[model samples]
Target: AQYEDGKQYTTLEKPVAGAPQVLEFFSFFCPHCYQFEEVLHISDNVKKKLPEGVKMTKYHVNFMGGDLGKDLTQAWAVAMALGVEDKVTVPLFEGVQKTQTIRSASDIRDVFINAGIKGEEYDAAWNSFVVKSLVAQQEKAAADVQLRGVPAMFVNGKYQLNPQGMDTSNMDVFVQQYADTVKYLSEK
Candidate 1:
């Protein structure tokens, strides 16, 4: 309730209409993003603390991987559209961050295949209009935010959580504060 602009959070230049929504901008190529997922498990923790009906969306940012970034975003879109994100998210992160084995679209497809998503389903989703549209929307959203970093969180597409001055020495405290800030913004 006592959040300050540009510190605790920053207001978007043009707000998108979606309250009770939490949008996470991240990059598979980012070490911090990988740690956030695997080490901190921030996304899941925050999700558990959010109010009911508050949707949390993860948008894979396309600026970090250069040309391959778009491919990764497409892969993420495909996973989401096919409802295999639960299976592919961690593996994709491991492939990109830990194993360094995923580099091309084909490699991405294999990750999906290994996740038990049939090759045909993965291929269809990869080329589907819905996935393409989602990819385009993610690209536009990242550009619109002028995001300079990964693992960023925005509530209701308007209030961005800024942790510059927050106490990050303790993970529990950090996550609780992060969730509280998100909850506050969603209901605001």
Candidate 2:
């Protein structure tokens, strides 16, 4: 799953059987993605108008192999394992950007611990097989897309709405893109 750098997502990778997949490719260290998060959670937008049986997923990318990116990427998958990603994601991104103190895996673990996932729960999730597998899956998802940057959106795993050079500032684009994606993939 982990890729060396330069693995741009080109071809097509169909959706899972049951539902159309809407994938958000992002990185914890990506400042633009950090900003894009606000746009994604808009009150009335792509997320709110999904047709039916559409699955929205977020995957961490590792375009840069710096220790911080690696640790944060793993931390993201581990956060999902603990089911505290909603509790930790924005905070983690904000923490790194505003405080610039989280530079290691342990620091990220502590971020979880601070969010009240300490002791056995923290230990279990951080070192569990699920976390490891999810990490690899996240790595693979990002790598499969061969994404050039964060904040890319993939529809049905085959069509990319904002793969590169996206203007995250325009929330309207996403809203329309999601609706179109739903209609187009409903038959597939």
Candidate 3:
């Protein structure tokens, strides 16, 4: 591979263990993050190229919207716990970033309701130990990354990909390079 250390990615001091993991740190409040998901479809594209047994996870950071950020993270955790991430993530992104309609925890809750998740089930997951723990883990993971921005990608929790280092002349090339870089890092 043609990846350059400290340019394409910087190695982590302590690599995260277990299956080769790709962790995405993003916030619904970030417009670029919205584009990363909806417009670029980066996750789906890269996912298709990832090696078998390699896992990808998205972590909603809590620094973008202050208290609302925390609430959104909680909403994400709840969605994950209820197995409705595919149902609510895009809607929440549209509501929060595109339409600017979601403004509070209540509005976020309505998104889940609109997704066909019953209010009681949403609440149960919202207050469940599993959801709470997930939320805590996400917050801790974000903090540990010492992140400077949203829509950041880390492979094996050790190498953080740098978008600036990528050749983004077009979507296809960009997606290919992104996936290839991740594949390279995953095998490292």
Give the best candidate by TM-score: 3
Candidates 1 and 3 compared by lDDT, better number = 3
- Minimal lDDT window, size 10, model 3: 12-21
The global C-alpha lDDT for each of the candidates, from Candidate 1 onward, is 0.83, 0.65, 0.86
Off by over 4 Å in 2: 1-20, 39-44, 163-188
Q: Is candidate 2 or candidate 3 better by lDDT?
A: 3
lDDT tens digits, residue span 1-188, model 2? 42111232333554333223777777777776776665455212556666667657777777754777877777888877767878888778777876877777777777788888876787777678898898888877776656677667666667655324333457677555544444454334
Which candidate has the top score in lDDT?
Answer: 3
Model 1: how far is 132 from its true place, Å?
A: 0.8
lDDT of 3 by residue, 136-158 (tens): 88987877778779989998778
Weakest ten-residue segment in model 2 by summed lDDT: 2-11
User: How many Å off is the CA of 27 in candidate 3?
Assistant: 0.2
For each candidate, what TM-score against the reference? 0.92, 0.75, 0.94
After superposing candidate 1 on the true structure, give the runs of residues whose Cα lies further than 4 Å from its correct spot: 18-20
Candidate 1 per-residue C-alpha lDDT over 88-146 given as tens digits, one digit per residue, 9 for 90 to 100: 88998899889989988898888888888898888888889999998988877776667
- Provide C-alpha RMSD values for all models, in order: 1.8, 6.7, 1.6
